[PDB]
Every structure is written in C-alpha cells, then in structure tokens.
Structure 1
Amino acid sequence: MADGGSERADGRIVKMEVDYSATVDQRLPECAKLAKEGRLQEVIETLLSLEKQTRTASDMVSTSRILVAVVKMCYEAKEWDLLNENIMLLSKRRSQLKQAVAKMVQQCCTYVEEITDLPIKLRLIDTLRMVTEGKIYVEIERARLTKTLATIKEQNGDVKEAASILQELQVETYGSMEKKERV
C-alpha cells in the first residue's frame, strides 16, 4: 500500500542519478494508478510526497544541468496533466500539494538564486499558472512575494513592474489569516 511505493522509491533512488528520468516517466503511470485509489487517507499523501519529491530530484538533475528551459514546461504541464490524469486536481488535493508545489517553489526558491533571466521567467510563467487554484489557495503565501518582487528586481525598480504588484494585494488577505507579514 505505502510500503510498495516505499520499496519502489527504495529500489529507484539509486536509479535517479544513474538512470534517466524517462523511467521516472515510467513511474508516473504506476504511481498514478496509486493516484487513482488512495484507499487509505495518509498513504497516497506519503506517496506523492515521494514521487513529487523525485520530480524535484529531476530538478536536481535537470535544472542543475543545462536541461532547464524546455524540461520545465515539460514538467509543470504534466503536473497539471497529473491534475487531470486520474482524479481531478491532483487526485485528492488534500494534505498532499502542500508538500508538493511549495517544495517545487522551494527548489526553485533555491534556483531563483541560481539561474539567470533566460529561463527564470519561464519558471515564473510555470508558477503563475497555479494562481487560480494551485499555489496560493490552501497554505502557500510569502513565496509569491519575492518573485513578484524579483520581477521588479530584474530591471531594479521601474514604474511598470512596480505597478504589476497590484493584481495580488487585496485578495489573499482572505487567503491566509495572518496579522503581521501580510500587512
């Protein structure tokens, strides 16, 4: 149930660096068949922690090497496709995206420090797709702020990107009940 994904992860974490991610693409269907059921509550959560974690391992290979700009829109487009493969909106969308996409922007929070302006705005369009439902609706906030800040930090403070903050100010006051940092 959970030990099956634990022993495939056990059997393939060596194969992450050694083997190519086409077999990760040959692990998304079987763990997607596990994404069909989720017969127990916590099991599929602990699964998609691992498989969405190995997608971040494919970031630790891909976005570490030059294989970045094409494979990102390979990645999140089949993440949204994974939101409609089996069950809609990442199968359950309970207790399991919080460890997934917050970790995606945690990795690319450690690649926004790394990579330059040629693919990093493609990463920005890869994360601005999760605005309407995905990224900031449940738990995430305060990670969008430094990248919409970083859009200002590219040219270092023009007028128009400083005006591009206005789309996200008043709304997510509702999104997270917090009294200090939102202010």
Structure 2
Amino acid sequence: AQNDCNSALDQLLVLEKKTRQASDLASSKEVLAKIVDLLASRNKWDDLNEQLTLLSKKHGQLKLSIQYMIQKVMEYLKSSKSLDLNTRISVIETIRVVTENKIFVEVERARVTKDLVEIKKE
C-alpha cells in the first residue's frame, strides 16, 4: 500500500541523482524496472501510465529505460480498449520517448506508432 509506493518514490529521488546528466554516475534500466513494475502492482496500469508520463518529462536514466516501460503499459491499455484507448493518444503527444526526438532509432519506436496509427485508420 504506502510503503512499497514510498520505496518507488524515495528510490526515484535516488535514481534522479543516479541518472547521467553530465559525467557523473550511470544510466540504468535496473532502477526503472523496480519503479514501474512495483508501482503497477501498488496501483493499476492506467494510473501508472498518467503519473509516469509527467515523470518522464524530467530525467529518466537515459530515455531508452523509459521507452521500454512505455511499451508494456501500452499493451495493457489496448487490451482493455474504451477510454484507455484514448489515453494512448494523450500519452504519445505529451512526451516523445516512443516517437523520440533525442534519437530516431529504435524498433520499439516504430511499433508503438504502428499500433496507434492502425486503431486511428480503423
């Protein structure tokens, strides 16, 4: 309930120090997997999705950590359909880490676009 959420939040403040913004420490998917999977557990996947999206607009242990997590949550939104389907649109316009402008390269980048575009055509 709160305690596990706190360990995500306090460990986020550890991770913000962690990240790489100059030549300091180091850019890890290990920390971000602890935050995003156990916050999905505390809450639900939709709730995770909105809070996470705001967090991504600041640091993120180099943005590939964030891009990987965004694909998992997205699959759950699609699975349920209705308003969560709408929520996929919202999220992708807000931040660019799966329509990424820091680098143009990735398979995850393309995949996440193809699913949004297919639902819009249909």
Contact 1:73 1:126 in 2 (8 A): yes
Select the residue among 19, 22, 31 that pairs with 1:51: 31
- Partner residue in 2 for 1:61: 41
1:105-120 residue pairs with structure 2 within 5 A? 105-120=70-85
Contact 2:77 2:85 in 1 (8 A): yes
In the alignment, is residue 100 of structure 1 matched against residue 85 of structure 2?
A: no
- State the 1:59 CA deviation: 5.5
In the alignment, is residue 127 of structure 1 matched against residue 80 of structure 2?
A: no
- Partner residue in 1 for 2:113: 144
Unaligned runs of 5+ in 1: 1-16, 84-89, 158-183
- State the 1:37 CA deviation: 5.5
Provide, for residues 28-52 of structure 1, a one-character-per-residue CA deviation record: whole Å limited to 9, x for no partner.
1122122256525xxx12x2x1222
1:1-183 residue pairs with structure 2 within 5 A? 19-35=3-19, 38-39=23-24, 44-45=26-27, 47=28, 49-58=29-38, 60-61=40-41, 67-80=44-57, 82-83=58-59, 90=60, 96-101=62-67, 103-131=68-96, 134-136=97-99, 137=101, 138=103, 139=105, 140-152=109-121, 157=122
- The one-letter code matched in structure 2 to 1:129 is T
Residues 72, 60 of structure 1: alpha-carbon distance in 2 compared, 3 angstrom cutoff: closer
- State the 1:113 CA deviation: 4.3
Residues 145, 129 of structure 1: alpha-carbon distance in 2 compared, 3 angstrom cutoff: same
> Among the aligned pairs, what percent are the same residue?
8
- State the 1:68 CA deviation: 4.0
Give distance in 2, aligned partners of 1:55 and 1:127. 20
- The one-letter code matched in structure 2 to 1:22 is N
SS in 1 for 2:13: helix
- Partner residue in 2 for 1:163: none
- The one-letter code matched in structure 2 to 1:77 is L
Give TM-score, length-normalised by structure 1: 0.50
Q: Report 1 or 2 for greater relative contact order, CA contacts < 8 Å, sequence distance ≥ 6.
A: 2
Q: Rg larger in 1 or in 2?
A: 1
- State the 1:24 CA deviation: 0.7
- Partner residue in 2 for 1:175: none
Residues 27, 38 of structure 1: alpha-carbon distance in 2 compared, 3 angstrom cutoff: farther
Give distance in 2, aligned partners of 1:78 and 1:127. 14
Unaligned runs of 5+ in 2: none
Between Structure 1 and Structure 2, the one with more helix by share is: 2
